[PDB]
Every structure is written in structure tokens, then in C-alpha cells.
Amino acid sequence: DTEFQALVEFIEGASYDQLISGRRFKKVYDVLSENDDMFIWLCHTAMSVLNPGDMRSRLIYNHLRILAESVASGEMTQRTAFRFFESAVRSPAYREIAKRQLEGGAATRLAGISAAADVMRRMGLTRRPMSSYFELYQRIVERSEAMTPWGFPPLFQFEERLSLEPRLKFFSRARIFWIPPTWNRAGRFLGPHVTLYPGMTPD
Amino acid sequence: INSGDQSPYRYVEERLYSKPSRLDREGVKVNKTYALQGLGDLEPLRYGANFGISEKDALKYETVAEKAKYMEPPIPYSSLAARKLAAGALWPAAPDPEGMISKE
Amino acid sequence: LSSGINLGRLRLAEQFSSMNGWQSKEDPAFDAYVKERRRKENYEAFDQRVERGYAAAAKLHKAEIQNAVKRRLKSSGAKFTAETLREMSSAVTERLAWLRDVWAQIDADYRSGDSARQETAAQEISAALRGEPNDYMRWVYETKRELRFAGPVGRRAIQEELQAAELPEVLDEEVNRYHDLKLNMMEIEREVKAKYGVAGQQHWAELQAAKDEEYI
Amino acid sequence: SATRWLPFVSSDLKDYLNRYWAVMFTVGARPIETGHIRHYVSWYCTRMKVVLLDHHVYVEPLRQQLQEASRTPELPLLFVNKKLVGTLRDVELLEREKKLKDVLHFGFEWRVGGSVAATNGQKSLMGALPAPYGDAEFFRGRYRGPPVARPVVSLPTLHPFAL
Amino acid sequence: VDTMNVLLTRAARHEHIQVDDVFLLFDELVALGARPDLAAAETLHTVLSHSASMPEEWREARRLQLVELYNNLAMEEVERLAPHRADRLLKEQMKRFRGNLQQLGSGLRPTVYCRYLHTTHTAAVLLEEVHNFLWELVPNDHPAM
Amino acid sequence: NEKYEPWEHMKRMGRLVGTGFYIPPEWYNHFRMFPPINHNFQTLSPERVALRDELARKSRLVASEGMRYYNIFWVRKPLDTMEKEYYELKRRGVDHGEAIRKVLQGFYSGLAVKKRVAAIQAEEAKLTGRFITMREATVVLGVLAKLHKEQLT
Amino acid sequence: ELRLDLTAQSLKEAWMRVSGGVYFQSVDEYYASVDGLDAEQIGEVLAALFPELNCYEAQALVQRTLECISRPVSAASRQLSRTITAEAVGLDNAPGHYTNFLEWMGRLTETRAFKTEHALFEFSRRKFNRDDVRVMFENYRLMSKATLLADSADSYSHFYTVLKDFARKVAGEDSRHQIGVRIDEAEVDPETGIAVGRGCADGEKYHFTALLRENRDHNGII
Known part of the structure; x- marks a missing residue:
């Protein structure tokens, strides 16, 4: 019960100081967000759009299930797991299966994410035993990976480069992206050490 | 936010997006607390x-x-x-179009 | 290749494609499969808190067996081959089977209906969830070391007393890992100040006096 | 490179949709409504093909086919990912509902219920859970929110196309 | 009134309660200083119509109380919507009070009608309410001119 | 970058475990049995169309510029009979242009006969004064309506 | 809604009088979701007992009788249909699987753990003032260490006791109250009917005391 300990030390510190400080709230924002349920929900939302009768979908399903169990066990770090996930997502077979599920009409991704929440409850992939159903409700009623048509969060890192080229207008046409140092006046604190990203402004 | 003989916009800009602020976020032991401590989904x-x-x-x-x-x-x-995706804050909203109105 | 296996895979793929073709009372073979799976699930399932306690205890036992294999390979200096991995996986699976057979009793006592059985089962579940190790494992390690260091009369007596008691197959490295751990000083101090009173405090004061004399 | 440069032209609407990501069919007599869609699409860094229907060789084939995809005879029309976005009343709605980013970049619209335009600070649920037995109006002492201010008279707008 | 609205609703949906204790709770809250509104009156009218295990003198006692309650509620909203010139809004309120009492086997009192007619502002609603008054005493299968 | 790849990471983990002094995690053996997914190693008949084009282009000049007949009724039966007359002439296989000349002469005869039949019926409808067509009826009920709108003014 | 819930509750205990005591539901009949009464049996009752009952009201009644026998009736799938549409999840031609999910998610919302996880979510989204933290301090100090261990045996009982007032606030306009201005008692002289009010300006220069009485002859003057 480390999150309850962080909650009660926040409560005692904010009642001792008679104000809501930034250090105490930063501490409890870091304790309440150290869980790896985000990547497990990414893998399970990618597993939900698959087909239980197809053998290629069985291979992708077992691969992403093993990946989620490896992240939940702590034996694999986050960045290599994101490399495995973006390699499994960018495949043409997975996009073909997602397109077939979209063109079906009575899609089985809702039962997929429901069984995913049940599996995350049973296998102990969460911090609390009934948090997976509230996270399922959060994935459904908000803009997330569950409401995307393909089953991954809509960032350009999870989409192919051949689809990234004709839509977006990036630096030059016909990895890590940086501002070249010929721009001496780009912004107030913008410089060559400030990275840029294709489909989002993280600032 | 307490200004301290500065404009508050430029003070919050220096406290958010400067190099000692992000290095204090990573942990350097800079002079005195150049970054904002407690921010939830308003953190960049x-x-x-x-x-x-x-x-x-x-x-x-x-x-x-x-x-x-x-x-x-x-x-x-x-x-x-994920919170910025649920809030739609991955890209800023488009302002009023200044291309064809005027330069007043 | 329009063969039997390929056409079977094709009709399986188009069956589970939408939501319609695989529901209840629609396909009899999938209904028989889910009936047999739910029939086995009706017998080999536990209560949910029993399953959480079993998951924590199984994680601890798997970690302890892996630590035993690490200690053996660290002391012997040998390499980790596929045969050691096969041995470790076999020992882990038989320990998980033994833990299932143990926690079946705790699930039966938690679902018995008596007050004392349910309270002892809740005590076992709360001890497993907090990470507290079992005293049965301590007794098993101690009686394995005493079986190792006794003579043949005592060895035959222990082997004849415990032949019918279903004991887990414990390696020597687990007993050596339990034995080679240093004892906690503050827990011994708390036990000697709870079991004995001011005499225990004077004994601990003269013990700290001997410690500071050996520091000199 | 390997072939000489040629301007693309076709008498079919779907040949434009299968070629470009974002196509817009404007007229020269409507310069304001095409300029707002130029501002919105270039804000999200999206490559766009603008087709001025004035002085075109296939006007009557294209004016008929734009009447079938969009039931309104309104120009300009935005077409992203072989779908119909629509005129300015549809583009400004997706910008107001914060849906124009994922429409232009990834070719889909969010079907999530609820609006993200009316937010206070960060976005959370804050009462999106279903209430037992309803009765959201029969609590008369319920929390109504912060006091909202409204203008007395409408200020003079700077331009008729300022928006 | 929000105390009485949530107590009369969520006790009627309770399983082990008896229907007299719902009306015993309503008599306590109106003695403690809670004004009855249209929302709490319709919940008592529904729990009266879904109560037949009680004796018929108990059902007629609560029917006369609900007739008095709907007549006092109709008179109170007539005096409240009079200076706002809300005769179109007051028309839909009196139509709801006519519908609640016709299901109860009664009608609005003519003292409420004499007050309602003297505060009317349009001649069309004046002639329409006596048209509703003459049709409330007779059933709907009655001959007419 | 290709130096961070799931196949490269699996090869690195495999040659790390193959020393014998590193212990494999469960995902290594579980990815040997389930490898990562790779992106590599993956109307009308036209002769009838031309026939109907030629016959429509040649009949448009006969009906509009030739006959000056714009209120023609039920044109599909003359067009289908000249089509089937062309097929009857193509059974015996006489020619191509001469068959079109003969079916155009038959089409001209049929259009002239239909014109004379309509003219005879219109003449007998105007001589007796007892019968009136529907177009005259709606134009009468329109002009009397407009005369009553003049009476409204 | 109160008509249909009271009608469905009337048929439930009338079925319990005629059945005679216990009614046990096994695993397989739970999966088929068949209770003791069929929809043919309940629809026969509503046609026989209630003469004046139309078609769409009768099938609405058999929907509530099936769900009131199993569990207490929860009005949560009607609200979930408004915030979650059918085409967002991908179930357009499956209305039966859509409504089976909406009551599955709706009854999952009404639990103690779901209200606890929503309160811990909104605590991380910074939706509390200093007033919420101070009452959470009183809720934590009232729990002793013996009471905390009984609540920490469950995964949510120790969290919910601190966040009980906060879960009421974040639930929206259903349970969060307005503060409102003060409404005191009237302080009027019972003999003369005179109420006394004070007013001040410039600190010490302007001090005024007003005595207010009700004029019944409408000749009021100041």
C-alpha cells in the first residue's frame, strides 16, 4: 500500500503546512503514475482488434500477450518493449486484420477489451484488483487507443513511413528530429538542442 | 504566480522552457528551483x-x-x-486567420 | 492449396470473424469445447483472494527455486545450459503443483462456513498478500538440514516419519540459502524485551556493553 | 525525374480522391471561404491539393459528382482520405470540437461522446459516471458551477470575415 | 424539498418497506417544514395506485389527502405564475394537474377555477379552460355540441 | 535506425545467454517460440455500343434537322425495331453501310407514318369540337386562373 | 420509471410467495441469464392482470421484471447509452450484444471499488481545494490502527473512508451541493415588529442604524 502511504503523507503534510504545495503534489503525482498499466492496456487494446480464428492473429496475440506479461514482470524495460510493440503494430498483416474488423460491422473488439480487463484482473497485471474495469471505462468514454479505428494510439510513431509521407508536411521530402542551427531566432528558448516531433507539439 | 519585478508571462516562460528549468527537472542541483514543482496534466x-x-x-x-x-x-x-490525447492537447488550436483580414 | 487443413483454418477464421457465428447454442463443437473447459474450471478454481494469495506464494517459490539454481551455479562455477533450464522449469512446475495442492485446503477452509476455519484461512491469505513467508517452509528447511546432519538411526527415523507426509522436493541450495542468512538484531532485541522484562533490558544493556568493549 | 512534369487532370471525382490525401474544390468567386480552409489545413501541416473549378476542362462532370458526394451545392468542399469533410460549417465544427487534428492527419473522426471544448483546466470526467435513478434536476441545491458572464451589447466586429 | 424528494423516491423503491410508512414519512416531513411540490406528489400518487393490500378506507383516506394536495399545489402555482404573465406556462401546469386528478377519480375544485379564470390575459385560454372544466366532470364518451 | 530492432535485440539476448553465465528471462524463450512479426518478404456489348452510337448519331439528324419533329412519342420501339432490322440484315450478311441505309429508310417511313397518324387524329379532334387534349385542359385552367388573378387585382 | 419498477417488484415477491422459499441459481443457468420466470410467463401475466396495457409498454415491463429478479434494478444503462453510442464501439448490427454490455458496465459502475478508483483518478487530476484536503484529514484521523487493518484487508475500504466526501463531490450535479449564501433567522421585536440594521462608511465618520417596521396601510415613508 504505497499509494495509500503517499496519500496519507500528502494529507498530513498539507494539513501541517496549511497549504497545497507543489512538492507534495508532485510526489503523489509520481506515486500514482508509476504503474505500468498504460503499456499493458496498449498491448491488450492491440490484441482486442485481432481474430480468434485466424492463425496469424493467434501469432500476433501470443506475441503481444508475452510482451505484456514481460513488461508486467519487470524483466523487460519500457523502451525495448515499445520497439517490440511498434514493430508488431506497423506490420501489414496487423493493419489488414484491423481493416477487416473495421469493414465487418459487428466487430469483436468490445469483447476483446472486456476479456482483456478480466485477464489483467486474473493475472495480477494491475496495482489494485478492480482497477482494470475503471481503466476500461476510461479507455471507452474518453479519447484513447480503444476508440481509434486500428487499436493503437494515433501517434505517427505507430504508423508506417509510406503513409507518413504524402499526408504530413515535414522538413524536406524528395528517427530523432532536430532544428538545424542556421535558425538563430526561432523562438524565445528554441534552439538546436530542442527536438521537434512530426505529429504533435509536446510543449 | 509571484512575479518578482518581472512580467509574469516571461517569468513563467523562463521557469517552464529554459535550459536550467529542464535540467532542474532532470536533476542537476541548480541555484534555486528554476522549474515549477507541482503540475498535473498542465506539465509539458x-x-x-x-x-x-x-x-x-x-x-x-x-x-x-x-x-x-x-x-x-x-x-x-x-x-x-494519454491525458493530453484525451484532452486533445497534442496540437494547439488554430487561431483566427490572419492571412486575409488586415495588418492593423 | 485447397486442402483439409487449409479449408478448416478458413472456416475457423470466418466463423470467429464477426460476433454472430460463435455465440451460445450456435456451433455445437465450440459449445462442447467451452462446456468441457467450464467443467474443468468449476472444479479447479479457487476464491479470488485465495487466487491472489496463491499468486504471491507462487511468485515467492519460483524466485526461491531460481535463487537456489543461481547459488548452485555460483558455487560450482559451471555454465547455464539448457539442461539446467529444463531442471529448473521442472522443479518450478512441480512446486507450483504442490502449492496448488496446498492452497486447495485453504480454499476449502475459506469456503467451509465455520468461523475458525474462515478466520485461519483469512489469516493465511493476509500473510501471503503482505509477503510474509511461511513457518512451514522454515520447519521444512530446518528438518532437511537436520536430516542431512544426523546419523543413520536419526536419518531412518526422519525418513520413515515423513515418507507419508507430502513434503515438497527441496534442493540443498534452498536450505543453504536459508541457513547462511544473518539474523536480525532488532527482532532479537524485541523478542528479548517482550518475552523478558527489565531483566531482558539489563541483559541487552550488558550485551551492548560487551559490543562496545569489543569495539575498543 | 524519370518522367516529364505534367499537370494532373481527370473527369472523375474518385481519381482525385485516390491520388491526393486532402483535395479541395473551390471557385474563384468565393475567396473568403477557401482562405479559412487554407488556414486550418496549413496549421496542422497537411499537404493539400486545391482545385479551382473556374477555368477547368471537366466542370460539368465535376459539378455533378460533387452533388452526389455532398448533397449541398456548397463550394468549397474538403475531401480527406476518400471521405467527405464538408464546407466551412463542417470544418469549423471539427476545429471547435478538437477533431480537426485527427481528421487531417489520420483520416478518422472521433466518435467519443461528450465535448472537449467546454473544459476547465485539465480534462477529466468530473461527473460523467451514471447517476443512480437519474434525478439530476430534482436536486435544487446542486452545484451549479462558477458564475458565467454575458455581454450586454455586441461589440462591433473588426471585419465581416474576421470570425 | 430535496430531502422529501429523495426520501419518498428511494424508499418507494426499497423492498422491505410498507406503503403506510411512506405516507407516515411524508406527514413527518410536511410537519418539519417541507413544502410539497409536483415531484413528491406524483411519487405518492404512484405508490397509492400501487397499494391494494391495505384496506379500502386507508386507500380512500390517502386519496382525499392527495386530492387536497393536488388542489393546494394547483392554487399555489396559480398565485406564483400570475404576475409573470406566464399563462401559456400555467396552461401546461393546469393540464398536468387535470391529468393527475382524473387518474385519481376526481377533478380540480371550482375555487381553483374561479381564481384561475380571473388572472387570465388572453381570451383564447379563457374560453379553453371552461371547456376543460365542463369536460372534467363528464367522461370522454359523453355527447357534446 | 536499424541497430534497435526486435530481431537485433533477440540476437543480442541469444548471444548473451549462450555464454552460460547469463540467465535467460522468460520472454527470450517465449519469443523463440513466438517470433516478432516481420514487414519483409510480403453494361453493354461494345459492338452494340458502336452500333447504337452510329444509329443514334444518324437518327438525331433525321428527327431534328430532317423531320423538324420534336414532340415524338415512344421512340424506343422505332429504335429497337431498326436495331432488330439491322440484326436481321446481319443474319444474311448483306453489307454494313447498306443495312444502315435500309434501316434508316424504314425509320424515316415509320416516323412519317406516326406523324401523319398524329396529324389525322389532331385534325379530327379539332374539326368536331367535342374532344380536347390534356395539355389544352391544363392550359385552359391556367389561363382562367390567371384571369381570376387579374380579377383579384 | 416509478410505475415500472413498482410493477416489476410486485411481480417478483408474488412469484416468491407461490414458489415457496429458496431459489438457487447455478453457473450454467446464470450464463444463459434465465431466471425463474420466462418472458412468455411474465407477458402472459401482464396481459391477464392488466387489461389496458399497450404493446410497447408491456415489453418494457417484461424487460424490468427479468432484471429485478436477478439483482436490484440499477438505472445506469440508460445514461450509458447517451454518453456511449453504438457506432463508437463497433456494434451497429448487434443490438443484443450492445445492451448486454451496457448493463454489464452499468452494474460495474455502482460498486464501491469503481467509486474509489474514480476518486483516486480525480485526486490525480488536481480537482480538489484546501477544503477537500482538510476534511480528508479529519476522515483519516478518526480511523485507528485497529480499524485501519480491518479496512486494509480489503483493497478499497481504507481508501474509501478518506475519499467518501470527495467521491460525492466529483460525482457531478447528482450529489455535489452548492454552498449558497447564508440564511439566518429573523430577529424582529414581537411587540413592535421592528428590525434593526446597521450601516457604516469611512470607518468613524458615517455610522447609521435603521429601524424597519411593516406598514399595513401602504403609507410607507423613510
């Missing part, structure tokens, strides 16, 4: 904890080419990225 996604850019790993490289060569690719998705 560049300086999140689960993000893939850390300036402490980037201080050992003397060139931007070495940073482009040796550094790992950044982590695409995080919890703060």
Missing part, C-alpha cells in the same frame, strides 16, 4: 518522467550530430501523453 510533455528525452544523458555529447547519432529513440506514449 517534453519534460515528462516517462518521456524518452533526458538532458542528463545529453550533457555528455558536445555536438548536435553526436546527439543525433548516439541517443536512443524517444518513448512515444506515456500517461501524460
